[PDB]
Amino acid sequence: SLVLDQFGRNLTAAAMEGKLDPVIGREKEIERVMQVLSRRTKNNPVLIGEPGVGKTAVVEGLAQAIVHGEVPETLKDKQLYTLDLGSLVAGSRYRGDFEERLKKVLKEINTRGDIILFIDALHTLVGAGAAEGAIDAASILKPKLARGELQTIGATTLDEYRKYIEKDAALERRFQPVQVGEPTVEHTIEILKGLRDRYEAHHRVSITDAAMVAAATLADRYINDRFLPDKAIDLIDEAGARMRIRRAEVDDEQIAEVLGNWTGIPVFKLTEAETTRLLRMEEELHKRIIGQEDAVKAVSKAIRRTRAGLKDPKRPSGSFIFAGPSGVGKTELSKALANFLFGDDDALIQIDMGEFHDRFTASRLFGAPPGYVGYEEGGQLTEKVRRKPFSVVLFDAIEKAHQEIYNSLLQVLEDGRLTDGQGRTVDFKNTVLIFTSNLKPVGLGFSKGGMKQKVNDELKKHFRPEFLNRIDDIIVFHQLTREEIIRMVDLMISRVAGQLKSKDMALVLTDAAKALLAKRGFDPVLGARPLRRTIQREIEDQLSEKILFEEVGPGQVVTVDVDN
Amino acid sequence: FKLTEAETTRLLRMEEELHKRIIGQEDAVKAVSKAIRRTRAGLKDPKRPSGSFIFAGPSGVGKTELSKALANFLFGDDDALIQIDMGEFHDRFTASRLFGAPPGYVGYEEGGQLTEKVRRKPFSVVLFDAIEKAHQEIYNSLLQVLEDGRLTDGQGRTVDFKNTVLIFTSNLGTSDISKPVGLGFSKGGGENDYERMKQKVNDELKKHFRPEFLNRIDDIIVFHQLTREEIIRMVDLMISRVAGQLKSKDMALVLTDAAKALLAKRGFDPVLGARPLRRTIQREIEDQLSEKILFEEVGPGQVVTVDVDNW
Amino acid sequence: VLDQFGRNLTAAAMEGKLDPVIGREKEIERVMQVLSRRTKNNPVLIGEPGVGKTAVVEGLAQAIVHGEVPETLKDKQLYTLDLGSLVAGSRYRGDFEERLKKVLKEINTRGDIILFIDALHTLVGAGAAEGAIDAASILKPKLARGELQTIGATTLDEYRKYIEKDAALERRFQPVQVGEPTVEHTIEILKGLRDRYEAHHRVSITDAAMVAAATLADRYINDRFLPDKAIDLIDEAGARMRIRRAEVDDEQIAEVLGNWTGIPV
Amino acid sequence: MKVLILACLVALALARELEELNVP
Ligand SMILES: Nc1ncnc2c1ncn2[C@@H]1O[C@H](COP(=O)(O)OP(=O)(O)OP(=O)(O)O)[C@@H](O)[C@H]1O
Ligand SMILES: Nc1ncnc2c1ncn2[C@@H]1O[C@H](COP(=O)(O)OP(=O)(O)OP(=O)(O)O)[C@@H](O)[C@H]1O
Ligand SMILES: Nc1ncnc2c1ncn2[C@@H]1O[C@H](COP(=O)(O)OP(=O)(O)OP(=O)(O)O)[C@@H](O)[C@H]1O
Ligand SMILES: Nc1ncnc2c1ncn2[C@@H]1O[C@H](COP(=O)(O)OP(=O)(O)O)[C@@H](O)[C@H]1O
Ligand SMILES: [Mg+2]
Ligand SMILES: [Mg+2]
């Protein structure tokens, strides 16, 4: 064809073909491009915005506005060629080969006189054709962009404008920063209704009105590394690609099952099984947690809030201080919660707060700041939640942190986000934060009976009451009663049998033997670790002597009679 | 730009439209709306920022919410609120997150959390949450802002703050200001907790900060603990969280006057009133609906009412 | 090894262009003792800057010609090597590595080379980094098999900071501590060098000049070491005598010391 | 005593490969 067609595509001729997506909205942004393009000296609008806001789609909406006739008469019938700089450098082996193939482009624009060049990725203009010798494409274009011999719409991101164009301060002045902002959800549902015809044509499925409202709403709060126009388009496009692999309609709920399989955040209307399990959530968490009934039905109600669609979209899903005596199930409930929501307690994000003993290990929560080592790894808590935003985040022994480790979590527990050292606010909104604080016999002085208010007010003296107001529920745990230690014996014997006696050996305990373990393992002030030390002192060390001696060995059922 | 007459009546009713998100807090909303009215009228000093506020007082009574309410009035969202906090900046070298690394140290081309967001929109409400929980070297760097409205980055370039609304939310005023009664004998409320107590919040800022940081900050507003009259109006605002998009889909949550009264009675602290009301509506309303939506006693196509059948 | 990045110190010692080395005869034996090893034969000369570490090797390069070799150092040419000169001119990839693999190719083909590299603090990080290809990754396989004889020179701090902090570099260079010489040893250095300084400046340096240069340099100068701060005094005094023109004494080296240090008279 | 060392990592000074201009 011609020179311009070799290196770019005529985006107006492709708009006459209808191969461009229709652009709803953006009328302030397109009229701002055309009023920059109509200027005398610099008529070069760079379209800067976050990656995803549709700053390419503005010119895609401009190339339509030319060929629809919505364009002013000073930009009437002007062919808007995009420019692949990679097509210009390709095959430019020889010395003047890139410069001539760039000046042939520019001679063609001045010859025709109806060309609006569109250099997408304007940060790649500097260094285009850079080598050991020859002049890059930016320093070629510098006299033409300032004097007005060339109309060039730029479209770079905000990061790439700062990293590569603002570091070339002569090139920055020769463009006009047109702030292509991230559209609102009310603007995105007009994008999506305008794009409904292009996805009903491609996927051969009709996307309902509620699914456009859902995909723009659900993408705003459940995604924060991507921008509204695209990430809401990503939910309509992929749910349209659900239904074309099952062939009718793309439901409101068809969007939420795409988002739920993408972030990992369950946002869909519940399966009949999952509805019954979540009303069984107390009695399923009691399969591991013996006792601690108000501890379970405080942390089970937080998951019922998230799954009933009553999660506060600013606040995290749950924020708990599991205070109480050492060994009664603070960490075990955080593991029983993580097994309930995920299937294993290895999905529990456990930040062991005893490691943070001074003020400067807070750089492990959010990583190093710029200019320091460990900046590239960007945090050992923030990056655990960018991958899994639906997470139970355990802060084990938060009392043993410094007094301003947890002051770094004062925006985590109301605003629901923590700014990374690299500069990324990460959504702690879909997390369940748990702060297990650890709070011997009787206290000072005369008192009847013998407690929870001693634990509550010690949190007021240790923790800063900015941090306590952000906690949803402070749960002081119970002493494990003797009727709960008997049930705890059955749980810990169920550890050594079946998981550690897969030797064709079966472990059976008589009811007098479980009563003897409960009478030896029961001390109110510790709870369930003296029981666990009893079982490895009465049962499974005498049993390990019987396996090595092969008194009772592999292929034989062990019964445990009572010793005395 | 010269004011559209619709926008002028918004600035004249700026207090009343910030009181649609802030309940109570009379002189707090007022002294912030005065900073926007002296800016759009063209009466701003062109050597200082548009507003340099300290929101001192009890934690979570509207300090960060007025900063979000101000960002709603000026932009329509809280995503234009440049909330670079200060309670994660406890070390001196975390000031390189505000400014970026100097060139030749990693993260210098992308560095700057504060200054690169302010350079995009110089008219930006900048919130500094928990300003006292930063290292003292950040203040000496942020003293450059309050004198000139210009600030040198790590890269060695300037950035305009003469149009920002700087808000230095300080949680100072929680030692015995977080305690409702003070020390010793005195009369009832407003004589033991605002005429015994607001001097101590001003004293805790004069000792923690250098004076030239406070002299250039043009408003220091100790905030009010919320009265029971300022809680009954908040329950109407907190139900609107629940009865909105969380319950808008084919359900309608209306609460009786008996039910709004119990939340104001159970969610009242005489030091607080935003967060314990947020918790008691979460515990007594929002946990009860979460069980009833999943068990489908309250489903789509119903109007669930809440009352108190105990009195 | 080419004469581009260093020079042949044994060919210089055969022509007698190197400094006569009086003293350090015990240190040269310790270098020969490390160089006579089958593996790890790499003596690093640990000494303060300007204590005569090259003068150990200049005397060692003479001992190749004088025949004081252990018969495993016989007819071994000793090319000195500026490690930083291979670094200079490297902004693109494979600039340092090509010029380092060339000079190691010219050792396997020639077969009698003893490199003297100075600045072994430059060895760690001669390229981009340690995970990148540096000279502290190319030399190391041949420094453990004895197929490459490199004589080193650090300070003591450069040896602590760059070699003792480097795993697998302590074991490949064997420390030879070139000490700081005493005042009488320094005079005997100056007694051997005077046939060069009296023939270069065309002056006569008296015996009283050197007993003063070994005393006044320790007495007044503390930022720099003796077997250099004493050589310098009878060097510049011969140049000042050539400039003012002839006999150097403890009055001619006197005003040379007064030029630097803040002494009005 | 509790004076922290401030690692202060430099940006990577690294080599560059080359596109070359072809000649006869
Ligand atoms: N106003 C709009 N109307 C219709 N579609 C839009 C609009 N804005 C963006 N889009 C669509 O959103 C998607 C974003 O792609 P686009 O290239 O426009 O984004 P961008 O902001 O240029 O991102 P990047 O900087 O990563 O290239 C495309 O499918 C585009 O058509
Ligand atoms: N509620 C419980 N249900 C089941 N097992 C329990 C319970 N409490 C304690 N145990 C047993 O004892 C162990 C200690 O429980 P857990 O790890 O939760 O301690 P903790 O309460 O966090 O104590 P600490 O104060 O030392 O952190 C459990 O792993 C389990 O073996
Ligand atoms: N006018 C109001 N006064 C008080 N709390 C409010 C108001 N409007 C909303 N809230 C609720 O209070 C919560 C806390 O935000 P708020 O700005 O009140 O905190 P704060 O006063 O800054 O306290 P902190 O010292 O903990 O930062 C908000 O998330 C919101 O749910
Ligand atoms: N025996 C000797 N010991 C030390 N230096 C000597 C000796 N003989 C001569 N010199 C002088 O040593 C200098 C060579 O530099 P050198 O002292 O080896 O530096 P560095 O100790 O820093 O390696 C020259 O001035 C030379 O004349
Ligand atoms: Mg524990
Ligand atoms: Mg706040």
- Tokens 């390189």 locate to B96
Do residues A75 and A39 lie in contact, with contact meaning Cβ atoms separated by under 8 Å? no
In 3D space, the residue among C199, C226, C188, C258 whose CA is nearest the CA of residue C21 turns out to be: C188
Do residues A216 and A171 lie in contact, with contact meaning Cβ atoms separated by under 8 Å? no
How far is residue A41's CA from residue A536's CA, in Å, rounded to a whole number? 85
Do residues B172 and B204 lie in contact, with contact meaning Cβ atoms separated by under 8 Å? yes
Residue ranges of B 82-121 with Cβ closer than 8 A to chain D: 91, 93, 101, 103-106, 108
**The pair of three-digit structure tokens given for residue A551, joined into one six-digit string:** 């008194």
Resolution in A: 2.8
In single-letter form, the type of residue at position A44 comes to N
Do residues C162 and C153 lie in contact, with contact meaning Cβ atoms separated by under 8 Å? no
Do residues A478 and A415 lie in contact, with contact meaning Cβ atoms separated by under 8 Å? no
**Phi, psi (degrees; rounded to nearest 5) at A138:** -70, -50
* N- to C-terminal Cα separation, chain B: 57
How far is residue B291's CA from residue A279's CA, in Å, rounded to a whole number? 8
Q: Which residues pair with A118 in a beta bridge?
A: A82, A153
Label the pairing between strands A391-396 and A431-436: parallel
DSSP codes, C242-255: HHH---B-TTTTHH
Tell me the Cα Rg of chain B: 22
- Tokens 């004469």 locate to C3
Name the residues around ion ligand 5, CB cutoff 5 A: A 330-331
**Phi, psi (degrees; rounded to nearest 5) at A507:** -110, 120
By alpha-carbon position, which residue is closest to atom 10 of ligand 1?
A54
Best of D2, D3, D10 to mutate (most B CBs within 10 Å, chain B): D10
**The pair of three-digit structure tokens given for residue C28, joined into one six-digit string:** 């040269």
Instruction: Give Cα B309 distance to the centre of its chain.
Output: 37
Residue ranges of C 126-145 with Cβ closer than 8 A to chain D: 127-129, 132
Do residues B76 and B125 lie in contact, with contact meaning Cβ atoms separated by under 8 Å? no
DSSP codes, B66-98: HHHHHHHHHHSSSSSSEE--STT--SGGGHHHH
**The pair of three-digit structure tokens given for residue C32, joined into one six-digit string:** 């020969």
Helix then strand then coil, % of chain D, to nearest 5 = 0, 10, 90
Closest residue of chain B to A373, computed from CA coordinates: B106
- B-chain CB neighbours of D8 within 8 Å are 105
How far is residue A471's CA from residue B248's CA, in Å, rounded to a whole number? 27
Contact A191 CB / ligand 1 (< 6 Å): yes
Q: How far is CA B129 from CA A307, A353, B272, C90, in A?
A: 31, 24, 18, 49
How far is residue A524's CA from residue A441's CA, in Å, rounded to a whole number? 9
For B277, residues 6+ apart whose C-beta sits below 8 A from its C-beta are B231, B234, B235, B238, B263, B264, B267, B268
Contact C151 CB / ligand 4 (< 6 Å): no
How far is residue A18's CA from residue A424's CA, in Å, rounded to a whole number? 38
What secondary structure, in 3-state letters, does A155-209 show? ECEHHHHHHHHCCCHHHHHCCEEEECCCCCHHHHHHHHHHCHHHHHHHHCCEECH
Q: How far is CA C27 from CA A377, B30, C50, C63, in A?
A: 49, 85, 15, 13
CB pairs under 8 A between A and D: 35
Label the pairing between strands A506-509 and A557-560: parallel
Best of C92, C95, C134 to mutate (most D CBs within 10 Å, chain D): C92
Tell me the Cα Rg of chain C: 20
**The pair of three-digit structure tokens given for residue A106, joined into one six-digit string:** 């520019």
Instruction: Give Cα A28 distance to the centre of its chain.
Output: 31
Closest ligand, as measured to the CA of A331: 2
- Method for this entry: cryo-EM
Contact C53 CB / ligand 4 (< 6 Å): yes
Burial label for C6, CB within 10 Å (0-12, 13-18, 19+), is: buried
Ligand 3 atom nearest to B169, measured from its CA: 22
- Tokens 């119970």 locate to A478
- A-chain CB neighbours of B76 within 8 Å are 184
Contact C169 CB / ligand 4 (< 6 Å): no
Q: Which residues pair with A431 in a beta bridge?
A: A391
How far is residue B142's CA from residue C260's CA, in Å, rounded to a whole number? 47
Alpha-helix runs per DSSP H in B125-271: 136-148, 198-208, 211-216, 229-241, 257-266
- Tokens 């300290």 locate to B54
- A-chain CB neighbours of D20 within 8 Å are 131-132
Do residues A506 and A557 lie in contact, with contact meaning Cβ atoms separated by under 8 Å? yes
How far is residue A141's CA from residue A131's CA, in Å, rounded to a whole number? 17
| Closest CB from A182, A301, A371 relative to B287 | A301
**Backbone conformation region of residue C52, classed left if phi is above 0, alpha if psi is from -120 to 50, else beta:** left
- Tokens 């030896």 locate to A520
Tell me the Cα Rg of chain A: 32
Do residues A318 and A367 lie in contact, with contact meaning Cβ atoms separated by under 8 Å? no
Burial label for A200, CB within 10 Å (0-12, 13-18, 19+), is: middle
Q: Is A87 helix (H, G, I), strand (E, B) or coil?
A: helix
Contact C154 CB / ligand 4 (< 6 Å): no
Closest ligand, as measured to the CA of C26: 4
**The pair of three-digit structure tokens given for residue A248, joined into one six-digit string:** 């009718």
**The pair of three-digit structure tokens given for residue B37, joined into one six-digit string:** 């009215």
Instruction: Give Cα C94 distance to the centre of its chain.
Output: 29
Q: How far is A53 from chain B (nearest CA, A)?
A: 14
How far is residue B53's CA from residue B217's CA, in Å, rounded to a whole number? 6
How far is residue C260's CA from residue C240's CA, in Å, rounded to a whole number? 14
Instruction: Give Cα C150 distance to the centre of its chain.
Output: 13
How far is residue A121's CA from residue A475's CA, in Å, rounded to a whole number? 54
Any idea what the Cα angle at residue C8 is, between residues C5 and C9, rounded to 5°? 120
By alpha-carbon position, which residue is closest to atom 24 of ligand 2?
A326
Flag whether A329 is marked binding: yes
Contact A52 CB / ligand 1 (< 6 Å): yes
Cβ separation B106–D8 shorter than 8 A: no
Count of C-beta atoms within a 10 Å radius of residue B210? 12
Q: How far is CA C31 from CA C26, C43, C168, in A?
A: 9, 6, 21
Burial label for A335, CB within 10 Å (0-12, 13-18, 19+), is: buried
